[PDB]
């Protein structure tokens, strides 16, 4: 006590979202043009792929809407070690904070389940779900979307950004800090806002 | 700007969980005891049915498990109107902040349904998910659960205390408050807590 709280974003940064959308994309309509994964630009892949080609973007965005979509996407390298290792830390507690989108039948549970599968029943507690982040507090959250917006103008987390191939090229505003990937020195992140 | 911001708990405030519980519970199991809505006392009826007889505990959670309980709950007397009004008010942002339980095949998809048929597809992006409230910021969260505890030592919000029959007996502690019912004054509530 205190206990440093950490928000940890699920899609693009725990779960591999932009390489389970271009294997499930390509995999069913094979005879459309992709978004190769270092081409991606701007958080939501359905957009660039609606600019594309004209109906890439329903396409696209039936891949992410149909059952296991969520569930298969495999975890980034690292992440399920790190998160792991960051809620075992003394004060320190760590929520998966995602959004359930704007589609519910499927994508809720899955996240549940996946998280099942990477880190126990016990870690289900953690999560939550909700659409505005900003209204979730905690010092940190790592998350891969550059603007996060919503009904909070002051939201008491530092926003940390987690690189992905669509953000990694942005030059931020100082002071606005990145977490590389996993395997970059998460812990002095976490230590620069303890006591 | 700056908006109040008010968390509402669905179940036992906007969805009747308790009417839905004995009505199901008596159906599927008719020669077993039940716990009359008047005779509820403590936020957990499944601990109360566990008392009342061995084995009914599981009976009872078996019950809120199942599919299309969560979907089938009817809303509470005022509860949608109530809600709809506060969320239409200028300088009031509305948050359904509600628990999956330990439950995830079923109840958060059908808790997100039943916000779509009683408010509609835009409101879908006012729920939060979450078994931990404490970590959800706000003016004021109305819920029916007396303890409410989490991560969170000092939560933001001042907790309202909305009547339900297992906790309408309960003398809370000074300058704890409570809302009786949807035809209670809410406005009054929401106004005490403006600039
Ligand atoms: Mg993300
Ligand atoms: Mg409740
Ligand atoms: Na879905
Ligand atoms: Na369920």
């Not at 809720?108 to 999560?127: M, N």
Request: aromatic share 10%.
């Amino acid at each position: 006590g205190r206990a440093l709280r950490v928000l940890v974003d699920m899609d693009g940064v725990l779960a591999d979202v932009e390489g389970g959308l271009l294997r499930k994309f390509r995999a069913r309509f094979p005879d459309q043009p992709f978004i190769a994964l270092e081409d991606r630009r701007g958080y939501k892949a359905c957009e660039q792929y609606g600019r594309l080609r004209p109906g890439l973007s329903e396409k696209a965005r039936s891949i992410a809407e149909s059952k296991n979509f969520f569930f298969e996407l495999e975890p980034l390298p690292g992440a399920v070690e790190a998160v792991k290792e960051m809620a075992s830390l003394q004060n320190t507690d760590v929520f998966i904070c995602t959004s359930p989108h704007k589609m519910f039948k499927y994508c809720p549970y899955e996240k549940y389940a996946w998280v099942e599968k990477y880190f126990g029943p016990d870690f289900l507690e953690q999560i939550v779900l909700t659409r505005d982040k900003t209204v979730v507090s905690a010092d940190l959250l790592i998350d891969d979307r550059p603007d996060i917006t919503g009904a909070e103008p002051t939201p008491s987390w530092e926003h940390v950004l987690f690189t992905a191939c669509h953000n990694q090229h942005l030059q931020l505003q100082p002071p606005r800090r990145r977490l590389h990937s996993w395997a970059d020195d998460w812990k002095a992140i976490l230590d620069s806002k303890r006591p």
